[PDB]
Design a protein around this ligand. Structure first.
Ligand code: 6ZF
Length: 265
């Protein structure tokens, strides 16, 4: 547990939700300050501690690192700040990022997801808004509030209650059977790639999640973004394989992105 007296919070929020807010701050560690992002809040306490419990178990260059929890005026989860922020907003404001640079970033996300898959955690909210840029050439996955540690004997998490879900990033098996696996995250990764090569445009613009579900049941998918490399559009379509068993895992997806990235230059 962190000492609230060593944490200073800035006023401007990096994000918000029903839980509360995410704000920038500075945390005095031993001899220096660390720039941090802090999630600030009966059930929510448990969820935040669960979220922290997930981040505590993860250690990978492409996942946001948790500093710790701090109980003060409210419950806080202190994380290392990825100062460039969400990938979708960054590309919206920086339309001249090169396709090669986007490949590098999404490949980095796939390395982090490959690690998550190996560790047997499902993210359940993979999306461009939850890819944070440390630099224009270094991305980290964030926002583990919906993440679950899979049981040693199962390869999916079965949701009891359908809450407010990010339907546009979810695979059909999630929507129809409440079943969440690493392959479900692979589907989300495809949507994420689409967002990335579309410079942070929203997926399925103007459609209700229910209309997205119906479109996908018809075998229809989002089109190729302007200027998106063919091989990357092809990878998206592979990620959007309806049948979970035929859809690739992150091991395969990362390898494909690695080979393509290394082949550019
Ligand atoms: C627009 N700008 C310049 C910035 C910059 C940084 C962040 C930021 C940096 C984080 N770093 C580490 C951990 N969390 C973080 C965070 N969290 C918010 C959330 C909200 C909801 C979606 N995902 C992200 N935001 C947000 N905006």
């Amino acid at each position: 547990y962190l000492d609230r007296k060593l944490l200073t919070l800035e006023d401007k929020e990096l994000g918000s939700g029903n839980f509360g807010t995410v704000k920038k701050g500075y945390y005095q560690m031993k001899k220096v300050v660390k720039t941090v992002a802090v999630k600030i809040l009966p059930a929510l306490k448990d969820e935040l501690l669960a979220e922290a419990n997930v981040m505590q178990q993860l250690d990978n260059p492409y996942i946001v690192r948790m500093i710790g929890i701090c109980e003060a005026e409210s419950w806080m989860l202190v994380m290392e700040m990825a100062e460039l922020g969400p990938l979708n907003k960054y590309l919206q404001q920086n339309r001249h990022v090169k396709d090669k640079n986007i490949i590098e970033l999404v490949h980095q996300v796939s390395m982090g997801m490959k690690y998550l898959e190996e560790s047997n955690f499902v993210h359940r909210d993979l999306a461009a808004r939850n890819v944070l840029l440390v630099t224009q050439h270094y991305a980290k996955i964030s926002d583990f509030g919906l993440s679950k540690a899979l049981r040693a004997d199962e390869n999916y998490y079965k949701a009891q209650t359908h809450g407010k879900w990010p339907v546009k990033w979810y695979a059909p098996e999630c929507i129809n059977y409440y079943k969440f696996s690493s392959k479900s995250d692979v589907w989300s990764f495809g949507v994420l790639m689409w967002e990335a090569f579309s410079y942070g445009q929203k997926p399925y613009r103007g459609m209700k999640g229910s209309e997205v579900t119906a479109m996908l049941e018809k075998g229809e998918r989002m089109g190729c973004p302007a200027g998106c490399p063919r091989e990357m559009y092809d990878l998206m379509n592979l990620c959007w394989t309806y049948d979970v068993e035929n859809r690739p895992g992150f091991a395969a997806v990362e390898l494909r992105l690695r080979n393509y990235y290394y082949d550019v230059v």
